[PDB]
Ligand binder design. Structure first.
Ligand SMILES: O=P(O)(O)OC[C@@]1(O)O[C@H](CO)[C@@H](O)[C@@H]1O
Ligand SMILES: O=P(O)(O)OC[C@@]1(O)O[C@H](CO)[C@@H](O)[C@@H]1O
Lengths: 270, 270
């Protein structure tokens, strides 16, 4: 024992991760545990460096939102040395790991549907890291909502969940369309931020469209342009995840499987 | 050497700290170091517990945005035991320690002064943790800008740098004046969020006032209501703090003193 828990997250400047980390931290403290946090910046190499670190540091349990390929076995080895591994946000192998995630597919499908009920001629998806399960789930959801859609569709999967990537992708989209799409879905608020930057760089009378995004932000309560938002239940995700690590630690019970937590739908567009 | 560095920060959900931590991390990685982060929630008890943790982890050096008194001798003990301690944001004893901070007093003064030039009939300060050094400097700069001012002045300083606390103070202030102040200065963006919440309960037409805040946010670029902002140079702060950490690590060279980094003034109010 060390009475400390580890948390590997991909982006410190992504407020959802900080929210979850803070939540994990507070609950853990109330249980007599300390939380040590580190970021991999969504890079496999860097995550692996942190792996050996928390392994040697001998934390009692490890929370991780991973970016490693599904074929990667590395966490299996820590788990065999006794280290309970709890996946967050990005699921790990359901046959060996316990994971706490969101209903990404259904949330995405439901997000794209609400935009269709408003006549979209064209519609686009802006996302990142298409190789990750989480993006595939959100892409698949977007596609399911498109069942029998006849308008133009475009999908952009960037190289990172970032504001800059969102700006770049929104730029490519606008050039490919010769103008704004009728509707747009961003798979993360961080991406939506970059989208706003691009809409900003155009005239005021040139920034209007059906908008829907994963996540949410106080900003959206003030923006003239209405935006549908699918927000995580951060507190629930952290509560459920902590439960599992503590059960593994204090009761030597661990049962592989996914625990999905539905996102909350904020419909800012009537 | 463990090739790890530690960072004690007050609030994971304060974007400025998340920003510094990320900057610190990416820079530290490029120099072959890993960064472990932990939060204190601005409580002396929790911070002392983390104290014990990072020394057990025996990190090479420790960054800390402390909430501890000028009468808590804890970082002196740690420092004498050979661990380099480096203050960020909140200064530690300049006789012993090496701190990286903003020009809080001058930033606040310049900020309040910019609101005054509009000749408000009243102006208010909203801050928190009045006992903290950083808070005393910010209240001071505000007071200075106000010399000679003849209008109504209000000062509200809360229990915590939080959105919820910002909301409560704003509500107290409005009941005080029987309406919005003509001008308002917030000492952290996190507090301003609470102010925005309070403003939203009012008609869309009863939300105008001259606003100045510490911190900055993308939202302030899209707001109809312009906001003057003093943004930290997060990257410069982290780079300097890191430079001081390595030198102390790999040269035993460590000269106390305060390295100030000016805030960037975003003057949206004409
Ligand atoms: O969806 P939000 O709460 O706005 O942002 C969080 C998020 O979408 O960004 C991550 C990229 O790593 C996803 O894995 C995660 O669900
Ligand atoms: O001023 P910002 O960048 O919006 O927020 C950062 C900050 O104001 O919040 C902390 C409250 O503890 C201060 O120490 C720090 O300067």
């Amino acid at each position: 024992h060390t009475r400390t828990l580890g948390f590997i997250l991909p982006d410190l400047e992504n407020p959802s991760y900080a929210r979850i980390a803070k939540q994990l931290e507070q609950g853990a403290r109330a249980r007599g545990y300390q939380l040590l946090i580190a970021s991999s910046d969504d890079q496999p190499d860097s995550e692996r460096q942190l792996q050996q670190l928390f392994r040697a540091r001998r934390c009692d349990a490890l929370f991780v939102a991973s970016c490693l390929p599904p074929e990667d076995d590395s966490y299996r080895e820590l788990q065999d040395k006794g280290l309970p591994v709890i996946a967050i946000d990005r699921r790990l192998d359901p046959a060996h790991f316990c994971s706490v995630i969101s209903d990404d597919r259904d949330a995405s499908r439901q997000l794209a549907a609400s935009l269709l009920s408003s006549a979209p001629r064209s519609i686009a998806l802006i996302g990142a890291r298409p190789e990750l399960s989480v993006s595939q789930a959100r892409a698949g959801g977007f596609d399911e909502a498109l069942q029998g859609y006849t308008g133009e569709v475009r999908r952009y999967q960037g190289e990172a969940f970032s504001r800059e990537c969102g700006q770049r992708l929104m730029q490519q989209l606008i050039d490919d369309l010769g103008g704004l799409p009728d509707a747009l879905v961003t798979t993360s608020y961080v991406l939506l931020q970059g989208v706003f930057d691009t809409l900003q760089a155009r005239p005021v009378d040139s920034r209007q469209l059906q908008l829907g995004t994963f996540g949410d932000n106080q900003l959206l309560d003030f923006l003239p342009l209405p935006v549908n938002a699918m927000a995580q239940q951060h507190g629930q995700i952290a509560a459920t995840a902590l439960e599992l690590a503590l059960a593994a630690i204090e009761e030597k019970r661990y049962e592989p499987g996914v625990h999905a937590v539905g996102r909350t739908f904020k419909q800012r567009i009537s």
